[PDB]
Structure formats: structure tokens, C-alpha cells
């Protein structure tokens, strides 16, 4: 999957429907994998840089694979 945004996690949102929304960079992406939830808050809590990789590279696109550096 191609690279979408790389950066620090601006804010994370836990949705009504049980999907997780992230803002890393200028994109606001989401995922329905219950596993990225706390991996993604951890990342944000500690200020890691995360690359999110996706074909839906735009506000509302969803994601499955991230790199945590």
C-alpha cells in the first residue's frame, strides 16, 4: 500500500460505531481494526511518528497498516 501521511498523531477519536479516527498530518483517517486503538493512543501519548499507508488517502479514507517509528 502506498504511503499516505507520516507524522505525529494530532488527535485520536473513538467513534460511536467502534471505529477509530486519527489525525496524523493534514489528513483525518480511520480504521475499524480493534487492535490499532491502544497501539494508536500509545503512539500519540508518547509522541511517536507514525506513517499510515493507504489507497484512500483523504479525509475519511480508512487504514489497515501503519509503521511505528
Amino acid at each position: 500500500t502506498p504511503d499516505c501521511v507520516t507524522g505525529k498523531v494530532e488527535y485520536t477519536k473513538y467513534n460511536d460505531d467502534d471505529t477509530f479516527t486519527v489525525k496524523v498530518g493534514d489528513k483525518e483517517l480511520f480504521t475499524n481494526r480493534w487492535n490499532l486503538q491502544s497501539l494508536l493512543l500509545s503512539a500519540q501519548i508518547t509522541g511517536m511518528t507514525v506513517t499510515i499507508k493507504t489507497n484512500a488517502c483523504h479525509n475519511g479514507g480508512g487504514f489497515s497498516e501503519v509503521i511505528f517509528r
Binding site: 491502544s38 500509545s42 501519548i45 508518547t46 509522541g47
Partner: protein, 264 residues
């Protein structure tokens, strides 16, 4: 308002580095061993005159890096031959007496500098040679753009000047070449952890150990052999209010941010 950095010897060098820390920051008797103390910094700018890249000759002397006191930001480099100060795009309004200003097309973040220079700090090598080389590409830069050549050279000087200024562990490993340094990953983690260490360290009260993120100190002596200078908590480099606080448990001091992340 201008200190020197004499790279003649490993002694001339450390001796100068000590001159600047002693000059811009006061100690903390709370963190002290063997008569070394952690110094905390305490706004403005000041020049640092680079000098001694080939002591025999004494030729390479018109480099001067402008530095910002409170955060040790390297706002850019002055060219004593023509007095043009080239500032990074994030310091587009910074100015230094006695110089004209010309704004570079990139900002100072490592993210960018590493992007442009096309190199990664982890594993970066530095010796007398590269530093000489690195001085020439800067000296010969005329223009607006932040090119790959000014990029690679600023990665290097920002490293032996501000990184080494802040960290006793990077000066020590680098000092040697002067009498080829490879910047380890362990040295990189440290640079990334300057602001959280500075928020915690003051809480040091005689705990067995200190852990901030991917960094741990096993004793006061380990805190000293690595960290020389800290922030006092031009955007700030400190983390915000109420957030990072050291939390002690079982004689271990932690930064609340890292414990919050590992406990869920």
C-alpha cells in the same frame, strides 16, 4: 555575546563547550557527583565562532553560527566574509546585529534537514575531514534555497555544537576524532528526549534509576556522563503544562507520559 568553539584539540574543544554552559546555565546541587553538576539553562541570541578545523594552517575562520539561548535552537549561519546571515525558514524574522539577512527555503527541523541532505542521523559519521569539507560548502553558499549541501553540513555542525552542548554523551564520543565518529542510535534517542528529560530530571531526588521513554539511567553517574545541560521548564522545547511529570515508584523515577502508554 559571542563564544568560540575551538576545534583544535579534543581539549580546546571540550574546554570551550564548558565555557558556554558555564556561561548560559546554572547548576543543580540536587544532581551532582564527583564535582560535576547538571546545569539548567535560563531570551536572546548569541554567536558562536567556529575555529580550529586545521590548527596547523589556521585558515578556515569565517564561519559563525547564530544560536538562541533558551532552547539552543541553531537559527542559522552567518558568513563573516560578507556578513550575510542565512536563517532557516522558521526564523524568518530573527536578526543579528551587524548583518544582512537572507532566508533559506527550508526550516531547521531534522525531518527536513535529513530529507534534503538525504541522510539519516543514525549512523552519521563525522571527522575533521567532513567538518572541513562541511565548512567549505557553507562558505561557498550564496543564495536562497536550502540545498542538499548546506543540509548535510548543518546536520553536522548542529550536532557537534548544540547536541554536544546539551549532551555530555555526544561530546565525549565525538571529542576523540579530534585527536571518525559514528552517531549511534543510542545518541539519536537522547536528542529526541531532551524536553521530557528536562521536565523530569529536576524531580531527581536520589532514586535508584530514571527512565524517560527509550532512555534509562542506572545511577547518578550515568545521568552525568550523558546529560550536561537542560531546559528550564521561538516555540518552547518543553512539553506542556500538567502533562509530563515524573512519577516515582519503588525508587524509580518515570515520566508520566511513558508509564501512561505502557500500562494499557
Amino acid at each position: 555575546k559571542e563564544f568560540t568553539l575551538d576545534f583544535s584539540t579534543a581539549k580546546t574543544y571540550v574546554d570551550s563547550l564548558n565555557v558556554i554552559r558555564s556561561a548560559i546555565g546554572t547548576p543543580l546541587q540536587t544532581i551532582s557527583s564527583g564535582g560535576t553538576s547538571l546545569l539548567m539553562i535560563d531570551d536572546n541570541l548569541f554567536a558562536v565562532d567556529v575555529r580550529g578545523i586545521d590548527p596547523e594552517e589556521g585558515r578556515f575562520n569565517n564561519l559563525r553560527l547564530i544560536v538562541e539561548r533558551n532552547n539552543l535552537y541553531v537559527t542559522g549561519f552567518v558568513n563573516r566574509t560578507n556578513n550575510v546571515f542565512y536563517r532557516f525558514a522558521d526564523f524568518s524574522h530573527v536578526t543579528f546585529p551587524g548583518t544582512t539577512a537572507v532566508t533559506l527555503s527550508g526550516d531547521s527541523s531534522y525531518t527536513t534537514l535529513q530529507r534534503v541532505a538525504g541522510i539519516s542521523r543514525t549512523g552519521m559519521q563525522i571527522n575533521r575531514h567532513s567538518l572541513t569539507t562541511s565548512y567549505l560548502d557553507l562558505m561557498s553558499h550564496s543564495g536562497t534555497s536550502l540545498t542538499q549541501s548546506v543540509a548535510r553540513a548543518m546536520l553536522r555542525f548542529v550536532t557537534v555544537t548544540a547536541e554536544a552542548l546539551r549532551f555530555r554523551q555526544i561530546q565525549r564520543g565525538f571529542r576523540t576524532t579530534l585527536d571518525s565518529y559514528v552517531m549511534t542510535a543510542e545518541d539519536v534517542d537522547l536528542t529526541l528526549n531532551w524536553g521530557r528529560l528536562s521536565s523530569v530530571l529536576p524531580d531527581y531526588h536520589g532514586q535508584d534509576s530514571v527512565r524517560v521513554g527509550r532512555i534509562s539511567f542506572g545511577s547518578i553517574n550515568a545521568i552525568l556522563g550523558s546529560v550536561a545541560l537542560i531546559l528550564n521548564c521561538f516555540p518552547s522545547m518543553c512539553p506542556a503544562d500538567g502533562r509530563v511529570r515524573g512519577i516515582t515508584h519503588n525508587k524509580i523515577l518515570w515520566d508520566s507520559s511513558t508509564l501512561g502508554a505502557i500500562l494499557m
